[PDB]
Each structure stands twice: as C-alpha cells, then as structure tokens.
Amino acid sequence: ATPADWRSQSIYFLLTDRFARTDGSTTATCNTADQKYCGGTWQGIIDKLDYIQGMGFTAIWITPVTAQLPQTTAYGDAYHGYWQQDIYSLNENYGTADDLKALSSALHERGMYLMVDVVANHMGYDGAGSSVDYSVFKPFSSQDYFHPFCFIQNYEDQTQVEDCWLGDNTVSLPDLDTTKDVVKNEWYDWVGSLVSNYSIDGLRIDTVKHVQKDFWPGYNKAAGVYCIGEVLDGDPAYTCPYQNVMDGVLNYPIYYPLLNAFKSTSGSMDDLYNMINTVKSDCPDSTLLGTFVENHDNPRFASYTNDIALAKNVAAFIILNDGIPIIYAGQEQHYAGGNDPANREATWLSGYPTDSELYKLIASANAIRNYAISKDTGFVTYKNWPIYKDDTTIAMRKGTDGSQIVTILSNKGASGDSYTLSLSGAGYTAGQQLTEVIGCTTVTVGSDGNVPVPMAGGLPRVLYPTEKLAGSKICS
Numbered sequence: 250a251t252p253a254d255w256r257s258q259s260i261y262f263l264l265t266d267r268f269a270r271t272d273g274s275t276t277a278t279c280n281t282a283d284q285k286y287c288g289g290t291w292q293g294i295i296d297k298l299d300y301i302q303g304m305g306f307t308a309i310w311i312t313p314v315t316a317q318l319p320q321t322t323a324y325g326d327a328y329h330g331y332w333q334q335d336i337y338s339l340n341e342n343y344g345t346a347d348d349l350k351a352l353s354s355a356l357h358e359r360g361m362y363l364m365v366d367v368v369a370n371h372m373g374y375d376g377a378g379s380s381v382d383y384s385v386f387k388p389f390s391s392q393d394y395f396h397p398f399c400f401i402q403n404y405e406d407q408t409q410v411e412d413c414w415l416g417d418n419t420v421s422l423p424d425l426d427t428t429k430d431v432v433k434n435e436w437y438d439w440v441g442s443l444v445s446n447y448s449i450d451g452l453r454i455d456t457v458k459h460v461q462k463d464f465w466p467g468y469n470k471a472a473g474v475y476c477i478g479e480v481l482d483g484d485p486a487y488t489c490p491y492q493n494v495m496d497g498v499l500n501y502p503i504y505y506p507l508l509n510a511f512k513s514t515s516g517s518m519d520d521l522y523n524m525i526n527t528v529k530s531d532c533p534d535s536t537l538l539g540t541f542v543e544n545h546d547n548p549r550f551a552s553y554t555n556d557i558a559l560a561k562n563v564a565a566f567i568i569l570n571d572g573i574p575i576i577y578a579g580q581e582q583h584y585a586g587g588n589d590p591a592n593r594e595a596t597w598l599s600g601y602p603t604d605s606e607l608y609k610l611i612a613s614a615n616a617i618r619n620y621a622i623s624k625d626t627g628f629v630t631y632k633n634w635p636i637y638k639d640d641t642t643i644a645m646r647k648g649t650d651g652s653q654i655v656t657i658l659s660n661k662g663a664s665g666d667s668y669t670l671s672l673s674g675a676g677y678t679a680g681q682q683l684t685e686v687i688g689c690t691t692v693t694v695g696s697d698g699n700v701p702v703p704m705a706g707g708l709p710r711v712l713y714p715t716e717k718l719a720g721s722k723i724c725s
C-alpha cells in the first residue's frame with residue numbers, strides 16, 4: 250500500500266514472541282528477565298485479530314521475520330527478531346512460510362494491513378571481533394560484505410554512527426557495508442521479494458540512522474510500499490530530514506515532550522505544543538509520521554505513572570495527532586514494565602480483556618478517527634492545530650471546517666477538579682451541538698462561538714458535531 254493509503258491507518262505494534270501463542274494460553278510463563286522465547290507465533294496473532302480490531306486498529310506491525318542466531322546468549326534469545334543470520338529463512342519459532350502468508354491473508358480478509366519490521370543495517374552474532382564466523386551469515390557469508398570491526402562510541406560523529414557496529418563484546422551486530430553495490434543490490438532484491446512473497450502492505454525499518462542516507466531511496470523504491478523509519482533521535486533537525494529519503498519516520502521528536510507532558514501533573518504542555526508546531530513546519534510531511542508514547546526500546550508509560558486518566562489522555566493524543574497512530578501491545582492493558590527486557594511483557598498474561606479502561610478509551614478514539622476519515626477525505630492531510638494551552642491543558646483541532654475533531658487533553662490526573670474551560674478557536678458555529686465522544690455527552694457552542702468544555706476527573710474530551718454523527722454507531 251502507498252504512503253497515501255497508510256495515512257488513514259492506525260497501527261497495533263506487537264512482538265510476535267510475546268503477543269499470542271498457538272495454544273491460546275493466557276497463563277504460559279513469560280518471565281521478561283529470562284529474555285527467552287515465550288512462544289508467541291503468527292498463528293497466535295490470527296486467533297486474536299478480533300481483540301485487535303475491537304480497538305479500531307486497521308493494521309499491525311510485527312517484529313522481524315528472518316532466521317536469527319540460534320544461541321541463548323548472555324542477553325538471552327533472539328526472541329525479538331533483531332539479530333538475524335539467514336535472511337532467506339524464516340524464524341521457525343513463529344511458524345512456517347504458510348503461517349506468515351495465512352496472517353497476511355487473515356488481515357486482508359478483515360480490511361487490515363500487515364506491516365513487517367526489517368533490518369538492513371546488521372546481522373547478529375553470539376560473540377564479537379575475531380570470534381565472528383562470517384560464513385554463518387546468508388547470503389553475506391564473508392567479512393568482505395561488512396564494515397571493519399569497531400563499536401560506535403561518538404554518537405555525535407555521523408560517520409561512526411553509520412560505519413561502526415552496534416552491540417558490544419557479548420552480542421555484536423556485524424555492520425553490513427551498505428555503500429557496496431553488491432550489498433545494495435542484494436538488499437533491494439530481498440525486500441522487493443519479501444514484500445511480494447508475503448503480500449506485505451508496509452514496512453517499519455529498524456536502525457535507519459545507522460545506514461548512510463543514499464541507501465534508503467533505492468530500498469524504499471524496491472519495497473514498493475510505504476516505509477516508516479526508526480530514526481532514534483528527538484531533535485527534528487536530525488530526524489525529519491530522513492523523510493527526504495524514506496516515506497515516513499517514527500515521531501521520536503514528539504515522543505519526548507508527549508511523554509513529559511502527560512507522565513506527571515507537573516508536565517510541560519508548552520514543550521509539546523512547541524514541538525507539534527516545529528514538526529508541522531519543519532518535517533517534510535507530518536501526516537506520514539508515526540505517533541507513539543510506548544515501544545520496546547523505552548519504559549512503558551505506566552512505568553512513569555499509574556494514573557489511568559493520564560494514560561487515557563496520552564492514548565487519545567496518539568490516535569488524534571497528525572500521522573499514523575501506533576499503540577504498543579500491552580499499553581491498552583496499562584502494562585508498566587521499564588526498560589528492555591521489562592517492556593517485552595506477554596500480552597496473553599492480561600487475559601486479553603476487552604472491558605479494560607484503556608481498551609475502551611482506544612476503541613472510542615479510533616472509532617471517531619475512523620468515522621471522521623470515512624466522512625472527510627481531508628482529515629488525514631489537515632495538519633493538526635494546537636489552539637490552546639495552559640499549565641494543565643492542551644487543545645487541538647484537526648479536520649475539514651464543519652467536520653473538525655476538537656480534542657482537549659489534561660495532565661490534572663484522576664483527582665483533577667471539575668470546572669468549565671471556555672475554549673476559543675474551535676471553529677464551530679454558535680448553537681452547534683457537539684458530542685464529546687469519549688463520555689458521550691453533548692456540549693453546545695455559545696453565542697460568542699466559545700465552547701464551554703466541561704472538565705472533570707482529568708479526563709480527555711474529544712468533540713465532533715452531533716449532526717455529523719447521523720447513522721454512525723458512536724454514542725447511540
């Protein structure tokens with residue numbers, strides 16, 4: 250699917266090892282500290298597609314599918330997929346080629362997309378340096394395909410970031426020489442054939458900043474689908490230029506101030522408001538970025554705060570921001586693991602309850618986003634507009650005039666006081682009825698055009714014209 254096709258999507262990101270077992274167990278042990286395969290599979294995902302689609306997601310992002318180093322390293326198994334050795338074999342832990350095709354086909358039947366994580370930067374090896382037997386790498390079965398062995402020490406030196414190795418002396422990530430025509434041609438052939446064999450709709454590309462920029466346009470073109478890059482940097486002047494060589498990037502610039510704004514009652518709405526405006530102006534296309542506050546490379550939101558109101562507000566932001574919302578499996582069950590490996594919790598140990606507070610919030614937020622998009626072809630290209638901030642509040646507007654969603658978020662938290670916020674700039678007409686679609690209340694626009702937004706419980710408020718909800722199953 251094209252970048253334009255992907256703009257309206259909403260992604261559920263999962264670890265194949267950690268989401269769903271073939272046996273469907275909700276009690277199979279998964280001690281994250283063990284860092285071992287816990288037994289999630291592609292068939293497991295198929296069996297739980299109702300759970301995911303119930304939250305109004307239109308797509309899933311799964312972790313890489315290639316065959317990994319075999320060892321239980323001192324850092325555990327390659328359960329995560331990022332330590333590949335044979336790119337022409339699947340990881341048999343997750344199932345067969347027919348299973349991965351079955352998952353693509355199951356998603357397609359339900360009108361959903363498959364996004365697959367891919368690594369071009371590196372292979373993985375249990376050991377480092379003179380220990381590496383380059384013959385185990387397929388097809389890059391020679392030291393000649395790799396950058397000379399060195400570790401990245403100066404992250405300020407972009408040449409060392411691209412040409413030196415990730416990992417360490419325990420588990421090294423041998424760095425492919427992506428400046429070599431044979432390596433480019435092999436990767437370009439591989440990714441085009443992966444996408445076509447498995448009918449993949451889009452790719453999440455790992456470790457994009459570790460590969461020189463001139464590699465990526467040919468990779469994106471050979472894939473033939475939307476590619477979203479992991480450029481792990483919060484500075485938009487570093488990250489947003491990667492959009493000149495790849496369709497999209499993960500919104501790490503928004504991540505840091507978004508997390509800060511909602512993880513505590515003293516969070517900066519100013520820093521988030523300012524970053525929305527910087528990304529909107531200075532990123533090639535903010536509507537092709539992926540918005541997130543949780544992933545497998547940072548502490549989960551609930552590790553910072555267990556306040557459920559704060560988690561509801563940050564989730565609503567992710568769904569209603571410019572670009573493609575991305576929710577990490579477990580976020581909807583308020584998982585509170587810290588850094589790797591604590592944030593790789595098995596989704597099945599929740600029991601997959603569809604009545605959890607954050608399952609319901611995400612379902613309501615995706616419901617209005619999916620509905621508004623079905624009625625307003627301009628929604629996904631209207632750049633999100635922050636119209637208000639104070640110490641504890643940010644309000645934003647998105648969508649075509651007369652159909653706009655106006656969202657009011659708060660970091661007051663669950664003990665927040667009840668009060669009316671008189672909101673200017675929402676762009677609705679005096680006497681217009683608006684539905685607050687999270688709580689299903691009516692708000693009427695005042696004679697002066699200001700919206701008397703009821704605030705309470707620190708809850709997020711998502712407004713949409715009542716008369717535009719005719720025939721929708723929202724708040725009925």
Ligand SMILES: *[C@@H]1O[C@H](CO)[C@@H](O)[C@H](O)[C@H]1NC(C)=O
Pocket residue numbers: 336337439442443446
């Ligand atoms: C796709 O399948 C073909 C067999 O037709 C094979 O030539 C190619 O290596 C496969 N590519 C991937 C990534 O599976």
Ligand SMILES: [Ca+2]
Pocket residue numbers: 370410411412413424425459460461
């Ligand atoms: Ca590299």
